[PDB]
Design a protein around this ligand. Sequence first.
Ligand code: BEF
Ligand SMILES: [Mn+2]
Length: 130
Amino acid sequence: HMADKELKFLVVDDFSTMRRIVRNLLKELGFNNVEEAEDGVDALNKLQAGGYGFVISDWDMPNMDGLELLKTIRADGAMSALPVLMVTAQAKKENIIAAAQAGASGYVVKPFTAATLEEKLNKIFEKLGM
Ligand code: BEF
Ligand SMILES: [Mn+2]
């Protein structure tokens, strides 16, 4: 997949407010193909529907947390390469290590600025040649 207007994003967080921030930032950046999920299970249901090129995900969520979500994606043959940007209040170095080692494409700590989201997305786009 490529970082063009068509790139389809999945935004995952148990709080509407945080999903709404991310969706609106993505709109500003020119990405209007954006769906939302409320937890890891919900996310996987939509991912399995097909077509997604990018996941932005919270950590602390009911039913399936974001670290489990990330691990599932990375271990699944059909989506193991999917970009996953963690966007979370979890700020301990050991959280960052766990997510990094699990295969996070990037990691943004809440609260975050519009500029921070943009540059961390762009960093992932460049790393993956999108
Ligand atoms: F709930 Be998240 F991890 F910010
Ligand atoms: Mn949460």
